[PDB]
Amino acid sequence: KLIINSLYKNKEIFLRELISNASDALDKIRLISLTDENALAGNEELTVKIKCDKEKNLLHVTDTGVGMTREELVKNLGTVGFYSAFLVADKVIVTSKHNNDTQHIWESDSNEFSVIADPRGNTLGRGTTITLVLKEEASDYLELDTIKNLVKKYSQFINFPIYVWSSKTVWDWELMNDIKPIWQRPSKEVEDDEYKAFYKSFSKESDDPMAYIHFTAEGEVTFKSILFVPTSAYIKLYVRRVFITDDFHDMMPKYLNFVKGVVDSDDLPLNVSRETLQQHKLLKVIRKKLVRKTLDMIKKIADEKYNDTFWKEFGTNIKLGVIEDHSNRTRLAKLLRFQSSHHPSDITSLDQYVERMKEKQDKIYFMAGSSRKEAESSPFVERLLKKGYEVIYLTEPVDEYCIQALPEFDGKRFQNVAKEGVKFDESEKTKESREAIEKEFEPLLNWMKDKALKDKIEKAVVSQRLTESPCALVASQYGWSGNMERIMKAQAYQTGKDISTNYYASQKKTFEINPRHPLIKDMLRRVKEDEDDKTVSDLAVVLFETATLRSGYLLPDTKAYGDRIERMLRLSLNI
Amino acid sequence: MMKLIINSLYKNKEIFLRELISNASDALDKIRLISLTDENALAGNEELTVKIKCDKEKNLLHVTDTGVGMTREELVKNLGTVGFYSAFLVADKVIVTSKHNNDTQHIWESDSNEFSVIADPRGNTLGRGTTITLVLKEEASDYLELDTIKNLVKKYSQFINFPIYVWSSKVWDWELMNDIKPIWQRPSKEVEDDEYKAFYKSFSKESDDPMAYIHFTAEGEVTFKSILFVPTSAPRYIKLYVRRVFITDDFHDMMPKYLNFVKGVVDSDDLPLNVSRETLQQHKLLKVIRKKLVRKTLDMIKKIADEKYNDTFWKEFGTNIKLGVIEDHSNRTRLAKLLRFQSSHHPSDITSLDQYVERMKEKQDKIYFMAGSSRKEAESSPFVERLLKKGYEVIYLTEPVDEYCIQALPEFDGKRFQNVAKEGVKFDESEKTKESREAIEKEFEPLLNWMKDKALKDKIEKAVVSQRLTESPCALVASQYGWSGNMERIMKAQAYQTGKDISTNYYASQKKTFEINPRHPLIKDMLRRVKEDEDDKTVSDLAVVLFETATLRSGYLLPDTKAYGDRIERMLRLSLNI
Ligand SMILES: Nc1ncnc2c1ncn2[C@@H]1O[C@H](COP(=O)(O)OP(=O)(O)O)[C@@H](O)[C@H]1O
Ligand SMILES: Nc1ncnc2c1ncn2[C@@H]1O[C@H](COP(=O)(O)OP(=O)(O)O)[C@@H](O)[C@H]1O
Ligand SMILES: [Mg+2]
Ligand SMILES: [Mg+2]
Ligand SMILES: [Mg+2]
């Protein structure tokens, strides 16, 4: 009283599940036999045998796999999968024999079951026979002509012999299956169609993979493998073509946990324990080779699909990789993509930035923020942008960490535009021009440092990075910037709890002023005229607090800042 | 670790014995656990004991247990790579004789460096178990005394639930050293305070008293004895026994996640003994035991002295009590009574909800709160201005969980909660004041309509005369079921650090209620110049800046700091003479 006639949509999937289950039973007895010599005592062979029965209206799926004990026949046989057998039959008869127990039978009509002993005894040796009593409607599955194609379809990647009872012109078993694994075949003998059809066989339906790679590893260890990149955000391990496990969760590093595939080695031990084989020295050589072939796979993807598709899905993985993977860092560095001032939305690689650098530019400039808009509208990038330097914009929380794990790219050091180190060159006769303006505005500097912003600024200097903005707060090289304040301060608030007593944390920054900006020109002209004035003092403080938000730091006191604004607003209105 | 582990523990070198008894007990727990599903698991050696022999003559100290033992492969993994290396504090050479049920008897020898495992020439001596033999070093060769071990076992192996015997003298025969009866099985009244504390230290280290403990016995649906503890610090857990037999410490569902810091013992005589681990964890009686553990933990937490509760417990585990209010529906009332928050009543002191209620006005029915990233932000907010003046108390919520905590508690002792940053704040009003406000609202209508229809058109829901401001000119009030600045902040950070951009949200980018203060000089002046000339740009420009600043003051994010900086600039030029 559930499915039966709705999923149905996938009308003949019952066989796929019974063939799949039989293969799983076959894999399991084989796996045990590698440690237990007397495991294959009941049956020499490892097969799946399907028998058509017209007269009695029956269909048998017989496997010589592990089998099931009475206790297992109760739990395992219940509620695609085993139950899908009821999409074509109204009664399932499961005859099973296991090594540790005698032979039993199981019969359910989708509602109630019964686990009797077999009055015939041990007729299987070891394994199971799934007898389906077909419905009058789905009785077409008794036909030998149709059932042959039905197994040829759902067992293209089953690596155990599948036989069906047929005849010629003499009844006998016929192989419908080729058990030569797909990963063991010559690279170009395998069509692209087959690679995609293999991907859907173990990832349980869905669409094609984004990319794949099939290779024979050479050198210290030799193995065959087909790895896959999925479309949206499990490595099977075989030894000498014998399935071992898919539960070795550390086959790939955490940052590549999305890769799917098979590994098949002739150089690893077969008759050893699963624990033993997990710590084996050669396996680690396989793991390091999987990473490199995976990065080779990722690099083989075409430029547009790489940016618009791969990167959108796994970009955070490459960033986590850069930090976590020391050996493959340089390779991971080239796979990174970030938005830059070059274009309003296109993402750029680090190489592309490099090729665009000016002849005498030694630094890769970056601005970090919570969004594209705040990063690009920052005062810090004003003159760099005007002079034609490109600035990388980092908008994600991991970006900062990512670049920090990268001490250089292609000989160039990264420079945060919110910190000191932004280089602006000049000639001899150009150096004096600045130095004159620098000493002209020096009274305004000392006044800000010893009165207007006495213990609120580390120092005041004449900026060379601003064009439109009057001023900005710049942090020390070993200090925390605006964005890093957030990243750390909103994690010290979320998880940390009280983190203020730190040297380069909440420390005074360098207050830079724009000499060409009217509010600095007036402030200078007016500071040499009174100094005791609270008006310009209120101007210096309001400008400093505005510059703070502008620079990306929090305000120490919103009430004090508010009180100052409203006092100016009084002036602007009264006269 | 290497050879600099001896100097770090030169103080505590007598502890080597504790470490050998602890392991023997661990070995005995393991073999006894196997025997619950395996009938013939004790066929090699029937008893479960700890035997210690003094052999002065050969310079050897023997510690013979009858536990699980070690196989060939287990000797080359477990031994080598506090602990077992503790034996080297008193012995230069250490040899272990051992016998496991699956293997034959082997001898492991080492000094610290290389190791070698040989098949014992004598053969299967112990049936099962291990003998740790110490070649006691000269400068510590005094433990081979017929009374020194006698005294150490008695003071150290307290709480070991297996019989420990030393090869004494009187005729040489084994003399019992300890009492096998567990501390949790003894009647509450009889157990000493020191004994409870020493018990806490035995299974969790940390060498300091626990913050609190509870020793109870459960009657009714299920019976079990238990001792539960509150540690002193938040670490940055519960041993189950069935009929005095250790089963596991791997059940991570004994306590709900919010009480994960609780450590202790549960000894049940009702649970199935001769069954598997899988079977026992899913067992229906456990859910009954769990509910009892939570109620008893809460009893203990409630029993802590008022001063100690706020000063020590609340600082360590207040977040857990907050998550509890959200997750534990059947205990909500008990937990809500345990909450502590900062409030206006005092600069730093925290307060319970009962204490707040008692301080409420005779006709106040709402518990008012202000949420924010810090106390400074919350107390200097515009929203508490009037309430504070008129003597209402405002709870201050500064941790991100606090809002979800209050938002999960619909009422406390009949009083609903109200966020001052939202619509819903009330003030009892004398007939004189009520009418005075009515005249203020009609007088200020021209300023309210100008703001809503042109000056701030499309920025605000409506412009109204406030009842909550005092010193502040204006503020942004969110709707009854909308997001406060604090919720906007928490959601934006969760949509950035974890989420994948919630720009086009549900109610994050929504207009707020702009409340203006009629008694504020700047607003008074703003009314005068608007009626005189509505199309004056200087007042329109001012309106924007006042609003934008009000947005920072109201705890909201400003939508364009660049444009706002530039408007503040224009204002500064006009304010001065640029
Ligand atoms: N032919 C079989 N031989 C042995 N065991 C089987 C067989 N068919 C089913 N089982 C057991 O019962 C379970 C039922 O299969 P199914 O419903 O497909 O679940 P699964 O996805 O794990 O295979 C299997 O996991 C297996 O434990
Ligand atoms: N008496 C013993 N009987 C059996 N195994 C032991 C014994 N002593 C030590 N071992 C083995 O050595 C391991 C390490 O002991 P120790 O260093 O104290 O670590 P731990 O107490 O945390 O297990 C034990 O876990 C066990 O595998
Ligand atoms: Mg299945
Ligand atoms: Mg004021
Ligand atoms: Mg400007």
Swiss-Prot record, chain B:
Glycans are attached at residues 23, 102, 274, 310, 331. It comes from the Eukaryota. It is found in: Endoplasmic reticulum lumen; Sarcoplasmic reticulum lumen; Melanosome. ATP-dependent chaperone involved in the processing of proteins in the endoplasmic reticulum, regulating their transport. Together with MESD, acts as a modulator of the Wnt pathway by promoting the folding of LRP6, a coreceptor of the canonical Wnt pathway. When associated with CNPY3, required for proper folding of Toll-like receptors. Promotes folding and trafficking of TLR4 to the cell surface. Coiled coil: none annotated. The record marks 277 as: Important for ATP hydrolysis. One of its GO terms (molecular function) is ATP-dependent protein folding chaperone. It catalyses: ATP + H2O = ADP + phosphate + H(+). GO terms for biological process: ERAD pathway; protein folding. Its EC number is 3.6.4.-. The modification Phosphoserine is found at residue 276. GO terms for cellular component: endoplasmic reticulum; melanosome; perinuclear region of cytoplasm; sarcoplasmic reticulum lumen. It comes from Canis lupus familiaris (Dog). Homodimer; disulfide-linked. Component of an EIF2 complex at least composed of CELF1/CUGBP1, CALR, CALR3, EIF2S1, EIF2S2, HSP90B1 and HSPA5. Part of a large chaperone multiprotein complex comprising DNAJB11, HSP90B1, HSPA5, HYOU, PDIA2, PDIA4, PDIA6, PPIB, SDF2L1, UGGT1 and very small amounts of ERP29, but not, or at very low levels, CALR nor CANX. Interacts with AIMP1; regulates its retention in the endoplasmic reticulum. Hyperglycosylated form interacts with OS9; promoting its degradation by the endoplasmic reticulum associated degradation (ERAD). Interacts with CNPY3. The SRT pseudosubstrate motif associates with STT3A during translation in normal conditions, preventing glycosylation of facultative sites until HSP90B1 folding is completed. ATP binds at residues 23, 65, 78, 84. The modification N6-succinyllysine is found at residue 462. Phosphorylated by CK2. It is an enzyme of class 3 (hydrolase). Belongs to the heat shock protein 90 family. This is Endoplasmin. Its main location: endoplasmic reticulum. Detected in heart muscle (at protein level). Keywords: Acetylation, ATP-binding, Calcium, Chaperone, Disulfide bond, Endoplasmic reticulum, Glycoprotein, Hydrolase, Hydroxylation, Nucleotide-binding, Phosphoprotein, Sarcoplasmic reticulum, Signal.
